[PDB]
Copies of this chain bind each other. A is one copy, B any other.
Amino acid sequence: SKLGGTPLDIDWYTSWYGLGMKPFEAKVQKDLIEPLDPKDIEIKPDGLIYLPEIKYRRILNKAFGAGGWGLVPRSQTIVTSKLVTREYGLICHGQLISVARGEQDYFNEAGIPTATEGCKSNALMRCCKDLGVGSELWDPVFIKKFKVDHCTEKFVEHVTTKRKKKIWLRKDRQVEYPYK
């Protein structure tokens, strides 16, 4: 309502089966809590570190295997005038793990069908928090220590607005669009 949008064996659309039922066995637990490789962490120009969704998918495929996990829609797609949002549930080994809401910003009317995939990835990322995957990305100590040895805040020039902005970038990457 407050979102100014209109809708775009086990009934997994509504079922809560297995949620918090029994923990996974040892090797899955070790695979899920494996420390993140520092080379896999990206940072946005405003200074926010994150992990690409494809790394989350790779971790899930390493821990549960292909066909051992999936994303199930839990609500209808809501298309706000500037974003597309939907709820998704993570199922691992026939077990409901989490239900999280994802969103993706779209900028063109024709980009709405593309935005619904970003939303899905966002939901997947937010579901993996219940598994402890990539938890260091939310650790303030980890963020603070990562940004002093692996990142740099450079005053670069925007290629379009012709203005200069101090942006954050990794020490291995280079200045990029929409800047120089």
Contact = CB atoms under 8 A, between A and B. Distances in A.
Given A113-B83, A140-B52, A17 B22 contact: no
Contacts of A54: 129, 135, 138-139
Given A2-B79, A8-B1, A28 B116 contact: no
A72 B141 contact: no
A21 B72 CA distance: 12
A70 interface: yes
Given A3-B112, A11-B16, A67-B92, A57 B130 contact: yes
Interface string A91-105: 111111111111101
> Interface residues of A: mostly helix, strand, loop or mixed?
mixed
A12 to B, nearest CB: 4
A19 interface: yes
Interface in A103-119: 103, 105, 109-110, 112-114, 116-117
Contact of A22 (B67, B80, B97, B139): B67
Q: In this complex, which of A17, A54, A100, A105 has the most chain B Cβ atoms within 10 angstroms of its Cβ?
A: A54
Give chain A's interface residue range (CB within 8 Å of chain B): 35 or more
Nearest to A142: B54
A33 to B, nearest CB: 7
A113 B65 CA distance: 30
A112 B70 contact: no
A35 to B, nearest CB: 13
Nearest first, the 4 A-B pairs at minimum CB distance are A23-B65, A23-B68, A2-B79, A20-B70
6 contacts: A1-B6, A16-B72, A22-B94, A70-B97, A85-B113, A101-B116
